């Protein structure tokens, strides 16, 4: 029926947490913090406190990351990269094309005012803006070959100057192109020249792309203008047990078992209702406000725990309204059918416990 009083109850649900981000079993997580994922991978100038970190349990990001891409542009296939970067155990940053002796015929000291650091203009740390020297922009063709049984992430960019006078003063050509070819890839980008509204006081744009090499494959670059050549790459090493979580909680030094975007949980109660998104081996999520069983129960919780055993909630582009509504329909259904299964079991589990002792009294009555 309605709310009732019972002698001994154990609330499976838990609605209390320390409320602090902390260590997950002993490995400190990556803390992007004041910087975004797109800014971090490209090596934003004000994002240089994470160059040393190369091992994590999960990745954090503030709700409104202030600065990422310092130079305005459109990161192509952004939402797909976050999915591939969620399950990376640890990578290794190596200089794929050394600045000293990989571009000896061009100019590599190119900076812009929109990426100022300490009051001085700079650029990214994982990219190299090429420009002609002496008045010539020679044909470039650089090849790479991955031969170490590890996928390699490669990023580059294409430049779209605001007008035409800009182009011939940098690359000395009218119709440039950039070609990237692999064993299972092919593209041919061309610059687009038009006037755009100012963003960050710049009328130009730079589109950033990426590709994921495979062991034994070869990637070949070719361009005669408007190329932002790579300087560093990443040797990925896929793993499990991580993800992107948006949070603003302070950091602290403890040792928990799992993590939720609002805190960590140290308890053995089978259920929780703080948040469905979590990382680690820790209790499920039930949308009820109060769940209890009159004290069977240990087997009851584990009976439906196995069936329930990520809800990542992958971000979608602004032009994918059909996707998000499709995923919102899926996510809400699974979290509402499952909370009703556990709610109904309590009405059935507690009811059996009543006559379980009453029949004993009748059995005692016979005896």
């Amino acid at each position: 029926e309605k709310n009732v009083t019972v002698t001994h109850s154990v609330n499976l649900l838990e609605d209390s947490h320390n409320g602090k981000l902390c260590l997950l079993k002993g490995i400190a997580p990556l803390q992007l913090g004041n910087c975004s994922v797109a800014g971090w991978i490209l090596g934003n100038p004000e994002c240089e406190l994470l160059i040393s970190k190369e091992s994590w349990s999960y990745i954090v990001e503030t709700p409104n990351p202030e600065n990422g891409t310092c130079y305005p542009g459109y990161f192509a296939d952004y939402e797909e990269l976050r999915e591939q970067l969620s399950s990376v155990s640890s990578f290794e940053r190596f200089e794929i094309f050394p600045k000293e002796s990989s571009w000896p015929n061009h100019t590599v000291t190119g900076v812009s005012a929109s990426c100022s650091h300490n009051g001085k203009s700079s650029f990214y740390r994982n990219l190299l803006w090429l420009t002609g020297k002496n008045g010539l922009y020679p044909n470039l063709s650089k090849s790479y070959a991955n031969n170490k049984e590890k996928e390699v992430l490669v990023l580059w960019g294409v430049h779209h100057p605001p007008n035409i006078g800009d182009q011939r003063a940098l690359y000395h050509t009218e119709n440039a192109y950039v070609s990237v070819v692999s064993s299972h890839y092919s593209r041919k980008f061309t610059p687009e020249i038009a006037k755009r509204p100012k963003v960050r006081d710049q009328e130009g744009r730079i589109n950033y792309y990426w590709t994921l090499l495979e062991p034994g494959d070869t990637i070949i670059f070719e361009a005669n203008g408007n190329l932002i050549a790579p300087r560093y790459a990443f040797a990925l090493s896929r793993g499990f047990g991580s993800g992107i979580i948006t949070s603003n909680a302070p950091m602290d030094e403890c040792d928990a078992k799992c993590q939720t975007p609002q805190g960590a949980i140290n308890s053995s109660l089978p259920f929780q209702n703080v948040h469905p998104v979590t990382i680690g081996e820790c209790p499920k999520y039930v949308r009820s406000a109060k769940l209890r069983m009159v004290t069977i129960t240990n087997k009851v919780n584990s009976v439906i725990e196995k069936m329930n055993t990520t809800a990542v909630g992958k971000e979608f582009n602004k032009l994918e309204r059909r996707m998000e509504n499709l995923n919102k329909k899926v996510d809400d259904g699974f979290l509402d059918i499952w909370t009703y299964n556990a709610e109904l079991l309590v009405l059935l589990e507690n009811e059996r416990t009543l006559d379980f002792h009453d029949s004993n009294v009748k059995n005692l009555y016979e005896k």
Partner: antibody
Amino acid sequence: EVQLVESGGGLVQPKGSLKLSCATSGFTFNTFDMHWVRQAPGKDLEWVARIRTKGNSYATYYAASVKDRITISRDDSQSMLYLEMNSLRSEDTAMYYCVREGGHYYGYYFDFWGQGTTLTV
Amino acid sequence: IQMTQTTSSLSASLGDRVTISCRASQDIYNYLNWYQQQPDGAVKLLIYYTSKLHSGVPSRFSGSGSGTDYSLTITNLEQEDIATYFCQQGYTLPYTFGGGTKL
């Protein structure tokens, strides 16, 4: 620092089994894959056989001509690499080296070498 | 697969700019390391990849080149830097060393 001391070299007849040995100091033996390089007088440097770490089930790869005559093992607990030879030949008088690979994604580069032992027949 | 080299020996002054080249038979995708051999002693590694540097090596050692034609350049050579150098691939399994050059 990183020193490599080796011993076991001497004179033998072309039927014996001289087991060479090498020792290490200054790092962890469980995260590096080491090699074996020999140099005969008047002959350029060559390669013999490579032993990987536990990340490849202690896989062992061998040169072409040397194959079917040599075997290597890793004494991780004692941190002394040891090699055993058999079926010698008169074209195997050479100075032997204890080498370390080094873990970074710039291929294989063999950054640390030993003093070298003299084996003659 | 097979590595040639420059002449076996070179005569160097004190203050010269000595270069040595190590051209490969096939194409090694920019994996050409260098080594130094002190006389009556062990050997040391100078450069890996193509133009990177090893910790504890002076700043007057540097390389260049790509494809199947690499080089090593020494500037303001001293009297201590006398040894024999080689070149080694890192591409495929039968790692090939060099023919040796004496300074």
